[PDB]
């Protein structure tokens, strides 16, 4: 297992695996939804569905290729997959359809049909997908009036004002050679890829991207979307967390692993070594929860999400969870830290060593764009093993004890108390 970075004008990164049976080749750009403004929000999500449109997918399918695309807050990628003997055809398809010609894809008949399909997807997301849209509303209230607040899909109000000239204006500012990384994963050797690119003279455009002026900033706030005709309540809560390239990046992920995830209907999930589960199962305070530690280029979020049918005891669920977060400053034990070390290593090993080269192409390109290289899994395991109890207590005294929070919620949330009752539970008046 080894990565190889090489620059000749174009940054080329590979990750060779001679045991895999497919190969994957694409390009990742270093702009996401946090490089848009409130008037062209959704222009990245439209460029994805233009690339995945029917006439473009049909040209690829006669060659034997498949297409993927992903939109995030800091990056976006466009990936072609094939059998290991036809990576030259997949690199040709990325040259013709995406680099040279774009007036074929941006015809008026293709643009209006794609815009209709995207507007239906965003409408069905806002009406049916309740856990993921509460987490989207948590980002917009915590980073309000700041580039990290814009949703990755766009809104229905901002998507209908978009024309063809808005997509060409975004492509001239961000789809550049100094913003791009060419990636290759699966069964493909590194020097075979750099000689196929150098046998041509690929270059997107010369110049740099615009520089935004407002930096990300956390603000303690809340947003409530009450809907009494829904059968549950869905709540997210977080503090300000760690960015990428932070010295406390792995300590924050281990602290979330201490409290973990839960499913009340799976019998083995009920037997986990988490002390919070004693209070919750006595009166059945929720159906599921999960803790997270998200990281971006400038900021991050640390907290949990939950879903509940017990709508008269919502205040007991928030109170018991926040009293366990107080113990990370005061009285976290050594056996809880050793359990979280083994489970964080199992979770990280499953994320980076799945058998999908499309997942590996997204992870490799996003990390080379920020850091310039990639940290191996062997070196990440040695940083996790060196964390002590005193590292956890010093991190939680800075980020958790007596700090501001952000709350989002939907459904039957009448039993959720107001902000200052929840804010005062971030300290004990004992220590």
Bridge partners (DSSP) of residue 15 are 3, 185
Residues recorded for the chain: 431
Is 227 one of the binding residues for another protein (CB under 8 A)?
no
To the nearest whole angstrom, how small is the minimum distance from the Cβ of residue 418 to another protein? Answer: 6
CA distances to 14, 259, 282, 284 from 264, in Å: 42, 15, 12, 8
Residues 56 and 129: their CA atoms lie apart, in Å, by 29
Which of these segments, 113-121, 267-275, 317-325, 414-422, binds another protein (CB under 8 A)?
414-422
The smaller minimum CB distance to another protein, of residues 215 and 421, is found at 421
Shortest distance, position 313 Cβ to another protein, whole Å: 15
Q: How far apart are CB 414 and another protein at their closest, in Å? A: 9
Q: How far is the CB of 134 from another protein (least distance, A)?
A: 22
Burial tier of 404 (Cβ tally within 10 Å: 0-12, 13-18, 19+): middle
- Pick 6 or 417: Cβ nearer another protein: 417
Q: Looking at beta carbons only, is 224 or 339 nearer to another protein?
A: 224
DSSP H stretches of helix in 270-388: 277-283, 314-325, 327-330, 334-352, 357-371, 377-385
Which segment (180-188, 214-222, 352-360, 417-425) binds another protein by CB under 8 A?
417-425
Query: 17 by DSSP, 3-state: which?
Result: coil
d(CA 184, CA 302): 32
Q: Is 421 in the site for another protein (CB under 8 A)?
A: yes
Q: Which is nearer to another protein, 186 or 409 (CB)?
A: 409
CB-wise, 122 or 416, nearer to another protein?
416
Closer of 126 and 425 to another protein (Cβ): 425
Q: Which of 163, 212, 351, 417 binds another protein (CB under 8 A)?
A: 417
| Residue span 105-144 as binding mask against another protein, x where in contact by CB under 8 A, dash where not | ----------------------------------------
Pick one of 418, 422, 427, 429: the residue that binds another protein (CB under 8 A): 418
Please report whether residue 424 would count as binding another protein according to CB under 8 A: no
Give the number of other CB atoms < 10 A from CB of residue 85: 9
CB 426 within 8 A of CB 405: yes
Per CB under 8 A, which region of 202-210, 270-278, 356-364, 416-424 contacts another protein?
A: 416-424
On whether the CB atoms of residues 290 and 305 are closer than 8 A, the answer is: yes
Q: Which region, judged by CB under 8 A, interacts with another protein, from 25-33, 50-58, 88-96, 415-423? A: 415-423
Q: Determine the longest span between alpha carbons in the chain, in angstroms.
A: 70
Query: DSSP letter at 312?
Result: T
Q: Which residue has the tokens 């070594």?
A: 273
Residues in contact with another protein by the rule CB under 8 A: 417-418, 421
């Amino acid at each position: 297992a080894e990565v190889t970075q090489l620059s000749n004008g174009i940054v080329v990164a590979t990750e060779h695996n001679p045991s895999a049976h497919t190969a994957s080749v694409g390009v990742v750009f270093g702009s996401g939804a946090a490089n848009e403004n409130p008037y062209n929000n959704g222009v990245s999500n439209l460029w994805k569905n233009i690339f995945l449109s029917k006439e473009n997918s049909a040209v690829a399918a006669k060659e034997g290729l498949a297409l993927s695309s992903n939109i995030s807050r800091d990056f976006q990628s466009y990936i072609v997959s094939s059998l290991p003997g036809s990576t030259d055809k997949s690199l040709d398809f990325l040259n013709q359809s995406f680099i040279q010609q774009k007036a074929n894809l941006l015809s008026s008949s293709n643009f209006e049909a794609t815009k209709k399909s995207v507007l239906k997807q965003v409408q069905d997301f806002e009406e049916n997908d309740h856990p993921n849209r509460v987490l989207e509303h948590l980002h917009s209230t915590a980073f309000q009036n700041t580039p990290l607040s814009l949703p990755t899909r766009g809104t229905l109000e901002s998507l209908e004002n978009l024309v063809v000239a808005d997509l060409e204006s975004f492509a001239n500012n961000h789809f550049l050679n100094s913003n791009a990384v060419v990636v290759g994963t699966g069964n493909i050797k590194h020097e075979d890829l750099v000689n196929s690119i150098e046998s041509k003279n690929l270059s997107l455009q010369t110049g740099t991207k615009p520089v935004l002026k407002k930096k990300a900033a956390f603000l303690g706030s809340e947003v409530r979307l009450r809907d009494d005709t829904l059968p549950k309540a869905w709540i997210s809560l977080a503090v300000e967390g760690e960015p990428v390239n932070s010295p406390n990046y792995f300590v924050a992920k281990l602290a979330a692993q201490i409290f973990g995830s839960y499913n009340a209907f799976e019998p083995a999930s009920r037997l986990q070594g988490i002390k919070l589960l004693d209070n919750i199962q006595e009166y059945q305070l929720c159906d599921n929860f999960n803790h997270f530690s998200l990281s971006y280029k400038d900021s991050g979020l640390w907290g949990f999400s939950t879903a509940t049918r017990n709508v008269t005891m919502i205040d007991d669920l928030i109170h018991f969870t926040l009293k366990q977060w107080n113990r990370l400053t005061i009285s976290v034990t050594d056996t809880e830290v050793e359990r979280a070390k083994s489970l964080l290593k199992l979770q990280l090993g499953q994320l980076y060593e799945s058998g999908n080269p499309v997942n590996d192409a997204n992870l490799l390109g996003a990390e080379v764009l920020i850091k310039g290289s990639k940290l191996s899994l062997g070196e990440a395991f040695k940083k996790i093993d060196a964390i002590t109890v005193k590292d956890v207590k010093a991190w939680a005294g800075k980020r958790l004890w007596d700090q501001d929070i952000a709350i989002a919620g939907t459904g039957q949330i009448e039993g959720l108390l107001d902000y200052m009752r929840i804010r005062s539970d971030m300290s004990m008046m004992r220590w």
